[PDB]
A and B are shown apart, each in its own frame.
Chain A
Amino acid sequence: QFRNRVINTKSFGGQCRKVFSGDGKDFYRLSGNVLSYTFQVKINNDFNYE
């Protein structure tokens, strides 16, 4: 199970670290700490009918 909030992932550190998500097509502000946050999609489909 995922448990409760441990890291402050919205600590911006005074930076204006915009990222454009091509997926959501919107500008988002990353926290100062996060090493990367990226939006490339992967879609991984198993059908198995018998």
Chain B
Amino acid sequence: EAKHCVRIETKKRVKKTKVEHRCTTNKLSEKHEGSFIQGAEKSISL
């Protein structure tokens, strides 16, 4: 996960002002599951 939020404000006067926000978020989840069962039988009878 990431949050990356930035904010800037500005004003100038003898009048102009800006207040501004931009921020972007990422999420990831990988999930893994695995199974392997192997087997062998021999039976030799006399």
Q: How many residues of A contact B (CB 8 A)?
A: 9
Q: CB distance A43 to B43 under 8 Å?
A: no
Quick one: which of B39, B42, B46 contacts A48, CB cutoff 8 A?
B42
* A-B residue pair count with CB separations less than 8 angstroms: 26
Tell me which residues across on chain A come within 8 A of B46, comparing CB atoms. 42-45
Does B25 belong to the interface (CB within 8 Å)? no
Chain B interface main SS type: strand
CB distance A50 to B40 under 8 Å? yes
Q: Among the listed A42, A47, A50, which residue makes an inter-chain contact with B43, where contact means beta carbons less than 8 Å apart?
A: A47
| Interface class of chain A by DSSP | strand
Q: Which of A32-48 contact B (CB under 8 A)?
A: 42-48
Q: Is the CB of A49 within 8 A of B44?
A: no
Q: Least Cβ distance of A37 to chain B in Å? A: 23
Asked whether, in the complex, the Cβ of B41 is within 8 Å of the Cβ of A49, the reply is: yes
Inter-chain contact A46/B44, CB cutoff 8 Å: yes
